[PDB]
């Protein structure tokens, strides 16, 4: 009734080793979503031109696919970047 | 300024055969042998219909033969 979207994103910062991967996973495993998709950011670059896109766009494809076949009834899906 | 770009090279998967060369070979020569057979069987055949076809003939003569002394020697007793 609202009208009001959802938020899309948030950002963790603080010194290494104080717990955001444990504070990401519950959160997603709290609001009943699928398994997350833990990336590095290191470990995407490569050599070849339109190899490092094709790893950051390979990752929505299930998303898009879930939403173009059940519309607004879809589950929620979740991605984790680290780095 | 590290973009680095390939070619491509293609091999041919070998062509459907290397099975056809054993059961090839046994399956010609089993037909081979058929031939022969269905051959045989029909001169066989051919002969077997013409005695038949001979045998008729006689068949039917002694079938009249035996009529008509029969009629004969029925009137001639009356
Ligand atoms: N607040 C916490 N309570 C309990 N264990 C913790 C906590 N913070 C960190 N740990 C322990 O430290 C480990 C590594 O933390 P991690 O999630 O890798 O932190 P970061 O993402 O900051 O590197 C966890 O698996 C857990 O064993």
Not at chain 1, 10 to 37: D, F, H, S, V
Request: glycine content about 8%; some cysteine; hydrophobic content about 35%.
């Amino acid at each position: 009734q609202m009208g009001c979207k959802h938020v899309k994103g948030i950002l963790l910062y603080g010194p290494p080793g104080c717990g955001k991967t444990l504070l990401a996973r519950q959160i997603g495993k709290m609001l009943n979503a699928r398994e997350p998709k833990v990336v590095n950011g290191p470990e995407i670059l490569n050599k070849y031109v339109g190899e490092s896109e094709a790893n950051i766009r390979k990752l929505f494809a299930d998303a898009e696919e879930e939403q173009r076949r059940l519309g607004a009834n879809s589950g929620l899906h979740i991605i984790i970047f680290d780095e | 300024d590290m973009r680095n770009e390939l070619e491509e090279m293609q091999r041919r998967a070998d062509q459907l055969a290397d099975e056809s060369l054993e059961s090839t070979r046994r399956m010609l020569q089993l037909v081979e042998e058929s031939k022969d057979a269905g051959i045989r069987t029909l001169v066989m055949l051919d002969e077997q219909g013409e005695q038949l076809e001979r045998i008729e003939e006689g068949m039917d003569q002694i079938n009249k033969d035996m009529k008509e002394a029969e009629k004969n020697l029925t009137d001639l007793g009356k």
